[PDB]
Amino acid sequence: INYYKDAASTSSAGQSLSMDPSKFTEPVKDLMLKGAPALN
Amino acid sequence: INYYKDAASTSSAGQSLSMDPSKFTEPVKDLMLKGAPALN
Amino acid sequence: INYYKDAASTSSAGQSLSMDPSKFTEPVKDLMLKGAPALN
Amino acid sequence: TVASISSGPKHTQKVPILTANETGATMPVLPSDSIETRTTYMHFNGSETDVECFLGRAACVHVTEIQNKDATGIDNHREAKLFNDWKINLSSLVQLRKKLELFTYVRFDSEYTILATASQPDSANYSSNLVVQAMYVPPGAPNPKEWDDYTWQSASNPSVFFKVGDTSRFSVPYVGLASAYNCFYDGYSHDDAETQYGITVLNHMGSMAFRIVNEHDEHKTLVKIRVYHRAKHVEAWIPRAPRALPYTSIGRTNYPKNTEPVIKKRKGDIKSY
Amino acid sequence: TVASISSGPKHTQKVPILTANETGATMPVLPSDSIETRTTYMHFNGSETDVECFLGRAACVHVTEIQNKDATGIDNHREAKLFNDWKINLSSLVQLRKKLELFTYVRFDSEYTILATASQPDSANYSSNLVVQAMYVPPGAPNPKEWDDYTWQSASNPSVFFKVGDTSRFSVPYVGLASAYNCFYDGYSHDDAETQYGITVLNHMGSMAFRIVNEHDEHKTLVKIRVYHRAKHVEAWIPRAPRALPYTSIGRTNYPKNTEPVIKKRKGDIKSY
Amino acid sequence: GLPTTTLPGSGQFLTTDDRQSPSALPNYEPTPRIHIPGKVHNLLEIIQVDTLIPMNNTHTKDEVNSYLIPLNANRQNEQVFGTNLFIGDGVFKTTLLGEIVQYYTHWSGSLRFSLMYTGPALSSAKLILAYTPPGARGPQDRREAMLGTHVVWDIGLQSTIVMTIPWTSGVQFRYTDPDTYTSAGFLSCWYQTSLILPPETTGQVYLLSFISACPDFKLRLMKDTQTISQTVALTE
Amino acid sequence: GLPTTTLPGSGQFLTTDDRQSPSALPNYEPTPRIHIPGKVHNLLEIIQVDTLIPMNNTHTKDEVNSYLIPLNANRQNEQVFGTNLFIGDGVFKTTLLGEIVQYYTHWSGSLRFSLMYTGPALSSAKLILAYTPPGARGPQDRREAMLGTHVVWDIGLQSTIVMTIPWTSGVQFRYTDPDTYTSAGFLSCWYQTSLILPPETTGQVYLLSFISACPDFKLRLMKDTQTISQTVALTE
Amino acid sequence: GLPTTTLPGSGQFLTTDDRQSPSALPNYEPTPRIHIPGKVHNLLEIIQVDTLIPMNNTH
Amino acid sequence: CGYSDRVQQITLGNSTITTQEAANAVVCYAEWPEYLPDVDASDVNKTSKPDTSVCRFYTLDSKTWTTGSKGWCWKLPDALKDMGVFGQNMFFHSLGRSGYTVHVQCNATKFHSGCLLVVVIPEHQLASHEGGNVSVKYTFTHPGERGIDLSSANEVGGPVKDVIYNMNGTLLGNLLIFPHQFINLRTNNTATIVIPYINSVPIDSMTRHNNVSLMVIPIAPLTVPTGATPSLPITVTIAPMCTEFSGIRSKSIVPQ
Fold first, then answer.
1. Which cysteines are joined by disulfide bonds (chains A, B, C)?
2. Interchain proximity G28–A6, CB inside 8 Å
């Protein structure tokens, strides 16, 4: 329960469970599957 | 939730979303439409 | 009612009514009934 | 959540251990790809690794010292510390500045805690029951000139009254003009051969002017006001390389000359353990 | 719950009073097995005998003394008590250490209370309105070197600000790497003929560095900080023999030479009452 | 601003109050728990385990013989041993049951006292364990001991006897510290007929005495124990 | 007046407590958010990115050659490089993974170690990356290294190898700071057969070593890092 | 006695905090409101009115 | 079904680049460039889209990779502000918006050895060589097609060129967090990195503010075979995409 009206008072959001490390680990145009030759 | 009975204790009303700048910008008797000649 | 989100804040659990002193008093392989000869 | 899957001997043409880093991709090779692994579970969520917790814990980010005394005859008050003002910057303390610089853009509503402690090294029979007025100064608000200036009214300037030792707690929504703070601004405020680089509108959030409003006692009470800050509603973008060299300035990545090595040299050749 | 059941004269071949302790079992022989008992009820639950209550009450577990003064000219500050640090150990106070050692493994989230009191034996006109900064130091966190070190920012190190006399109250989830604390560790951290026995990763939880952040007054205020601890979410395993000899160290069951007898010698022969 | 009124005693630190607390380690996750054998939920589970009593508490220094009750052959109508039932002092002060009881001020329930014979297998002997409820002096003879609660022990294939000391008290709970009003009574053992040893055997045979609590045992009102001490805060 | 009782520790400033707060800017509206690429929600997403390791950490000053592992041709049964697995110190102290780990006290999971060959395309060489779990000394020969977890690297069209260091520990979490009890082991590389360079080529060829965390990596118990310092509050 | 814990910054006077307050004039009744022309609800309504600019600012 | 992942062709406007030993193109943060949607615009003037005129491969002056070269750094759109009509659309407005498709070229035989680090560092605010509180002068950070040669001598107002510290105080080994690609002479000769518009605002200035910076840092030293020229040409080709400009204005006046 909040005691104030404006959003500056609300508490933190906790944790963002929506993870997606692909944008940083595999920022490649063509799809690369584990095991298959990276270049062919 | 309020902790007191009299209206001097209640909190502010926040924001009055009901706006009407026409009374200050167009306080004219006859209606003036944008684009049409102001005087004719 | 809790005032915090993380489990480090919750109160104690009270009492664990699930008791089982047999594991400490009778940690024997074969079952031993009161009255019957312990060894035969 | 499964941590490691069960995998036995592998004799196939698919080599998950061989790749080409020239593509710039990091293949998510798991332990089951190189050895025989058993079924294990994570038993871990990662709540403390989120940007909201990594950057969202209260910490000291600035400090100053002032006094409350008989100010008679001190023409230059502010420069004599009858009240001191600090430009809000999250880049003056290094242990939080580095965490903030780990990313290029950060959006957050802030939380401030102003810690003042009363003290008297010189002869002083007691420590007054002070009431500190903390004031927010937006860009344009009259940068006060004296401890008794026409500004302390605080009609539009936010003010918080409180006694020394106890702290104020006010929240600030994200006050940037962009969608986040420009942790790195590879750009100038305008096109001039004499303008400052990096430090621009995105950097200046105003300033905090510290004082006491109580009329003076019989002695100098040198007050040191330490400021603490927690980040709220933290959102991060464009992760960057960790800070290696220290800082000398605010908002500038400039470093000193002949800086000391950061890599721990080995004891012996490369083959030593 | 029934305490004692009704039982009259017993003339049978089943002898519940005769057994063989060579089996290692404790037969639950009741009073109704040896005499004639009446119907009685327990009227008792045993809420205060649970491990959560036996080990989960706040108590003092460590203490130190420090000062807040003009620190000018004291090259070695920490060793001069301008700030003192204590390695977290539940084995420095004996009346709680024994209760904790009654078992081999204990898992608990902790509760700490740091009690500081202001005092001035020497000439001092008042007792300052202090604001004590209590700081948690995880393994690796920079063990501060001076009262004004780059650590007190507390960006990742937990900090709690509070005035002397009043106490902080922060909870700590179970910070062990195992599923419990190794109350007894019949094992070494690694295989070396010069390593320490027992005291290992399981023992070191960090340390608590005590200080004051207020700038000095005109006198030495010798502060004694007593630390109190309550155990929460207590779970116990592998009950052990009660502690008989006292301690000399933390985490070690080593005792002194020529220790005093613990068994109360009788007054007379074995037949005396 | 919610109007509130601070009741007397606000801001005090009570060493027994169990309240909530904000944590300085947000989003932390305690290690996932694993199965560990021998989990203890209540002290009443471990206190029921038999432990050797230093009944032969007549040595200059602590020795293993302190737990060995000496027996002599060819002894008729003679006492074996005698002890009070102050479980928080005396011979029981050092036992597990006594150590757990010393952490509490009040105790109730029945006690389990057992003796195990360790002499030769070809030996024969009959002993009588007699419990003397409070109010009467310690038995000075066998005829006076046998008037109260007693159990005749026939030593044979069964090497251990289990005599449960019945709860015989007016008040619901007795004090753990030695007190006259809450005295538990006296415990003694006597030679029923005699101790007969087989040929080619000499010396004394010894009994091992055990103490354990019954499932009807009670403890409350925790207190600080006097079995451990400290005068210098500990360093590594 | 709602009766209340102030619990111990009231009015304290805890550097980790996350509570509500009244705002001094009423009716303010935070800027509407826009789409910005590369949003970071958790450090476990960015820590899995490969970063060059200064494996050749034998220079007087920091140089680009520190990340270049020198290789010599015509070398049989010889070591390439050797390093401990204290990710919070040594060669890994400066890497992104190590920098992120130093902000925490406990770490767990498997590490991803990769080597990329940069020599001539007409060159042939076979290397064996060997991981030595804790408890045993660092391998001094190839026969001792190949007994543990190892991956034979055949240098060909595939220029990069990816050897995942498996999580082999008794305790669930290791300490980030160098500690004996929570040692991660040792990592070394050896020449399998030899390094063969094509004609008209001389000098040494170099390998680029990468370090990244697996999706099963864990971090907790944040702490202050020792890689940055300050002794004078900053001015413009 | 409801157990409470005073958070940091208790008892401070913030010049922007809008909270409730007990009144020292109980049972008072504010005057009944009347119609007054030109009511201003937001400054964005009056700021849109044309005003002469001192463009010839060279005197 | 037979194809190859190293044979790639990128056609933009009237320019076409062909390659047969290219690595999988890197899309920075898996976000392709897209036109500014109306839901985020803050300026009121309508944007002009010189789609075909400016979105083409512009080849920059090739660099000489020697055994002692430290690296090269380019700023965008600064690197293309003197290139045809793109430079005019960049100057004659107060702001601009456009993506970039970087294409680095470095070919060699199977005998050469070396590795180049092609990395895109958004908001690469460089460090000055004088320290203290010195600034870096606009005249240097905005070279144009010239770029910044990290092996040359420092001039008053140009940032420091210590390639080890990435000219900003970060170690070279940590630049891999950014979208990058290695040009390994044995495996790859041409790198491709599609760079979208990265900024905290929907639109920002394009003359005084450079969103991204391209760097080519040789990691492994160039080891040419015995008797070969100790130099290899590095040609950088950048192609704008999704270009936008707002507020056609009197020409932006830069020094010189």
1. none
2. yes
Cα atoms in the Cβ-side hemisphere of radius 13 Å centred on H30: 6
The boundaries of the domain holding residue E34 are 1-273
Total domains present in chain D: 1
SS3 content of chain I, % helix, strand, coil (to 5): 15, 35, 55
Q: What is the DSSP annotation of D158-188?
A: -EEEE-TTS---EEE----SSSSEESS--BB
User: Under an 8 A CB cutoff, do E215 and D121 touch?
Assistant: yes
The amino acid present at D122, given as its one-letter code, is D
CA–CA gap between residue G189 and residue G191 (Å, rounded) = 7
Of A11, A16, A24, the CB nearest to G49: A24
Among G73, G54, G53, G82, which residue's Cα sits nearest to residue G126?
G73
**β-pair partners for F188:** F82, F130
Distances (CA, A) of E101 to E98, E181, F37, F102: 5, 10, 17, 16
**DSSP per-residue string spanning F70-115:** EE-TT--S-EEEEEE--TTSGGGGGSHHHHHHHTEEEEES-EEEEE
How many Å apart are CA G187 and CA G111, to the nearest integer? 11
Q: What is the Cα–Cα distance from G101 to D43, expressed in whole angstroms? A: 19
Structure tokens, F51: 């432990």
SS3 annotation, chain B: CCCCCCCCCCCCCCCCCCCCCHHHHCCCCCCCCCCCCCCC
Domain range for G82 is 1-236
Cβ distance A27 to D28 less than 8 Å, yes or no, reads no
Chain F residue numbers with beta carbons less than 8 Å from the beta carbon of D54 are none
Residue type present at position E63: V
Q: Scan for tokens 């940069």, then name that residue.
A: G118
Domain positions in chain C are 1-40
Interface touch G22/A39, C-beta < 8 Å: no
Q: Where are the domains of chain I?
A: 8-248
Domain I8-248 has CATH 3.40.50.2300: no
Chain H, nearest residue to D172 by Cα: H16
Distance from CA of D125 to the nearest CA of E (A): 5
Write out chain A residues lying below 8 Å of G40, CB-based.
24
Q: Do C11 and F38 touch (CB under 8 A)?
A: no
In sequence order, the 6+-apart residues with CB closer than 8 A to the CB of B32 are B26, B38
Structural determination approach: cryo-EM
- Tell me the resolution in Å: 2.8
C-alpha distances (whole Å) from G197 to each of F186, G121, I54, I176, I222 are 96, 9, 46, 29, 15
Number of domains in chain G: 1
Element (H, E) at D66: strand D59-66
Q: Does E165 touch chain G (CB under 8 A)?
A: no
Q: How distant is the Cα of D160 from the closest Cα of chain H, in angstroms?
A: 4
Residues of E in contact with C36 (CB under 8 A): 14
Residue I147 CA to residue I61 CA, distance in Å, equals 10
b/e E182-210 (16+ beta carbons within 10 angstroms → b): bbebeeebeeeeeeeebbbbbbbbbbbbb
List the one residue out of I216, I192, I244 whose CA is nearest residue I77: I244
The SS3 call for residue E23 is: helix
Instruction: Write out residues 24-43 of G within 8 Å (CB-CB) of D.
Output: 24-25, 28-34, 36-43
